């Protein structure tokens, strides 16, 4: 979508968890892109086509106080 690239990630059981790892070891961002390449190389090449926007969805916290219903 025009305000959400890679939208198929947004709720996934791995996307709930792999970002928590990178938020403690950003040195393993390469090692997570490589890990996606061992099980979904089709997702990997799609993330690679959007990498600057993937980092925005990747670097945020997996939960936030806005999850109660909205931003205000």
CA distances from 48 to 9, 10, 53 (A): 14, 17, 10
Long-range interactions of 59-66: CB distance < 8 A, separation 24+: 59/19, 59/22, 59/23, 60/19, 61/19, 61/23, 62/15, 62/16, 62/17, 62/19, 62/20
How many other CB atoms are there within 10 angstroms of residue 30's CB atom? Answer: 9
How many other CB atoms are there within 10 angstroms of residue 18's CB atom? Answer: 19
CATH architecture assigned to 1-72: Orthogonal Bundle (1.10)
Domain boundaries, given as residue ranges, for the chain: 1-72
- The span from the CA of 54 to the CA of 65, in Å, is 22
- Asked if 10 and 67 count as a contact pair (C-beta separation under 8 A), the reply is no
**Run of H or E residues at 21:** helix 18-22
């Amino acid at each position: 979508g025009s305000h959400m690239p890679l939208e198929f990630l947004r709720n996934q059981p791995q996307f709930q968890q792999m970002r928590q790892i990178i938020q403690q070891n950003p040195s393993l961002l390469p090692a997570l892109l490589q890990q996606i390449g061992r099980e979904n190389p089709q997702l990997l090449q799609q993330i690679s086509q959007h990498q600057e926007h993937f980092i925005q969805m990747l670097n945020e916290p997996v939960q936030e106080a806005g999850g109660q219903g909205g931003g205000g």
